Scaffold this active site. Structure first.
Site, mmCIF file in Angstrom:
data_model
loop_
_atom_site.group_PDB
_atom_site.id
_atom_site.type_symbol
_atom_site.label_atom_id
_atom_site.label_comp_id
_atom_site.label_asym_id
_atom_site.label_seq_id
_atom_site.Cartn_x
_atom_site.Cartn_y
_atom_site.Cartn_z
ATOM 1 N N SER A 1 25.527 38.831 42.052
ATOM 2 C CA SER A 1 26.129 37.645 41.431
ATOM 3 C C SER A 1 26.683 36.392 42.327
ATOM 4 C CB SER A 1 27.238 38.140 40.636
ATOM 5 O OG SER A 1 26.735 39.098 39.567
ATOM 6 N N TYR B 1 33.894 38.375 32.074
ATOM 7 C CA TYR B 1 32.675 38.200 33.115
ATOM 8 C C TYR B 1 31.383 38.595 32.567
ATOM 9 C CZ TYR B 1 30.356 38.402 37.698
ATOM 10 O OH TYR B 1 29.492 37.986 38.740
HETATM 11 B B1 LIG Z 1 27.084 40.497 39.639
HETATM 12 O O1 LIG Z 1 26.828 40.847 41.093
HETATM 13 O O2 LIG Z 1 28.592 40.683 39.739
HETATM 14 C C1 LIG Z 1 26.604 41.202 38.423
HETATM 15 N N1 LIG Z 1 27.011 42.562 38.557
HETATM 16 S S1 LIG Z 1 26.255 43.799 37.649
HETATM 17 O O3 LIG Z 1 27.092 44.937 37.519
HETATM 18 O O4 LIG Z 1 25.835 42.992 36.431
HETATM 19 C C2 LIG Z 1 24.517 44.406 38.065
HETATM 20 C C3 LIG Z 1 23.523 43.897 37.588
HETATM 21 C C4 LIG Z 1 22.314 44.120 37.924
HETATM 22 C C5 LIG Z 1 22.085 45.397 38.919
HETATM 23 C C6 LIG Z 1 20.934 45.732 39.586
HETATM 24 N N2 LIG Z 1 19.727 45.582 38.969
HETATM 25 N N3 LIG Z 1 18.742 46.256 39.513
HETATM 26 N N4 LIG Z 1 19.566 46.649 40.727
HETATM 27 N N5 LIG Z 1 20.811 46.292 40.541
HETATM 28 C C7 LIG Z 1 23.280 45.766 39.719
HETATM 29 C C8 LIG Z 1 24.816 45.157 39.083
HETATM 30 C C9 LIG Z 1 25.823 46.068 39.898
HETATM 31 F F1 LIG Z 1 26.336 46.740 39.197
HETATM 32 F F2 LIG Z 1 26.698 45.000 40.008
HETATM 33 F F3 LIG Z 1 25.366 46.354 41.031
#
Ligand SMILES: *[B]([O])([O])[C][N]S(=O)(=O)C1=[C][C]=C(C2=NN=N[N]2)[C]=C1C(F)(F)F
EC number: 3.5.2.6
Length: 358
Positions: free
Chosen positions: A61, A147
């Protein structure tokens, strides 16, 4: 490198690496505008490849800061306005709940409860339209922050529509190329695969998986050198020769909403400096960072405040990143790791380092 920087970086990071069992790490400190680099451990444990200044990490992110600045550049180009209705750029979005939801709301997570993730079931473009058409907001627009990748990710996709460029082409030509970020990628090319670190999750080597709006929300990969340059660019946008990009950087650090002591920018988040370290440290924990919080509108947004702690955390399944900087002090840090370790540990280390150098 100045011994002060060497010492505070090593004394903070070495224990962090041990406590968190981080396989590989790169750190950049920007001090008086100049970068200093540090690396530890392994980009690829099995193949015994060390982290170097050329190793690519998944930013997760932290990508949202590139999205916010690209959107700011589009505003500066006159291609979009944050006050525009979402439907202006997505006419097929006819459902009535979208009345009153603007690009500002998408960019800043204030649309009324768009979810953290786009469902994994959303595979096609038609699936994505259905998802947004059927989504029911829990709250009126501009009242609560939640978020969400599905919020800022849609902002990024719509922001580039008038240009006719793909999101990736827009990002490359309008942000990466002008800033000389020549080792920063939405899709890692074959030429750079030897440098692409593996992420580690439960001891398994992993890379990010494809998903809807991935590029826009969490899909950038970069090196510690390019990330230091990203921090330099955000610290001193007036040094940037491209007028709209200079302006887009400033727009991304404007303060649009307040919740507690935090202000929401475009991708970037900001607190007044000096900060209460417990505020940013504890506030970075996902139990707080991911919660639904009432927001106060800043009407109109405050232009980028130089006396700010400006920062963003990022994660993918295998990686954990953090960037923070203080414009007024020409001071910043980037921490890239190939393990997704807890946010508060990142913020604590960053504050220990920046506070000592400040
Ligand atoms: B940002 O980093 O805050 C988004 N965080 S998240 O929880 O939405 C997210 C999204 C996607 C992935 C991922 N896709 N393929 N490998 N990892 C991981 C994550 C997180 F949980 F933050 F690691």
């Amino acid at each position: 490198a100045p011994q002060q920087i060497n010492d505070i970086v090593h004394r903070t990071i070495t224990p962090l690496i041990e406590q968190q069992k981080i396989p590989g790490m790169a750190v950049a400190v920007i001090y008086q505008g100049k970068p200093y680099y540090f690396t530890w451990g392994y980009a690829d444990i099995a193949k015994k490849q060390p982290v170097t200044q050329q190793t690519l990490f998944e930013l997760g992110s932290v990508s949202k800061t590139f999205t916010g600045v690209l959107g700011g550049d589009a505003i500066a180009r006159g291609e979009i306005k944050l006050s525009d209705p979402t439907t202006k750029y997505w006419p097929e979005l006819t459902a009535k709940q979208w009345n009153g939801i603007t690009l500002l709301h998408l960019a800043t997570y204030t649309a009324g409860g768009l979810p953290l993730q786009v469902p994994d079931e959303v595979k096609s473009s038609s699936d994505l339209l259905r998802f947004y058409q059927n989504w029911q907001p829990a709250w009126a627009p501009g009242t609560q922050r939640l978020y969400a990748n599905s919020s800022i990710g849609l902002f990024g996709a719509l922001a580039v529509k008038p240009s006719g460029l793909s999101f990736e082409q827009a990002m490359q030509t309008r942000v990466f190329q002008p800033l000389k970020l020549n080792h920063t990628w939405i899709n890692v090319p074959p030429a750079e695969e030897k440098n692409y670190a593996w992420g580690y999750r439960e001891g398994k080597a992993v890379h990010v998986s494809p998903g809807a709006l991935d590029a826009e929300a969490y899909g950038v990969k970069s090196t510690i050198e390019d990330m230091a340059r990203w921090v330099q660019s955000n610290l001193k946008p007036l040094d940037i020769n491209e007028k709209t990009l200079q302006q887009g950087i400033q727009l991304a650090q404007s303060r649009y909403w307040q919740t507690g002591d935090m202000y929401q920018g475009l991708g970037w988040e900001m607190l007044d400096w000096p900060v209460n370290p417990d505020s940013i440290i504890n506030g970075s924990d996902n139990k707080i960072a991911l919660a639904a919080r009432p927001v106060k509108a800043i009407t109109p947004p405050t232009p980028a405040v130089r006396a700010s702690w400006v920062h963003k955390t990022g994660a993918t399944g295998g990686f954990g990143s953090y960037v923070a900087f203080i414009p007024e002090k020409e001071l910043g840090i980037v921490m890239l790791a190939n393990k997704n370790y807890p946010n508060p540990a990142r913020v604590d280390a960053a504050w220990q380092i920046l506070n000592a150098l400040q």
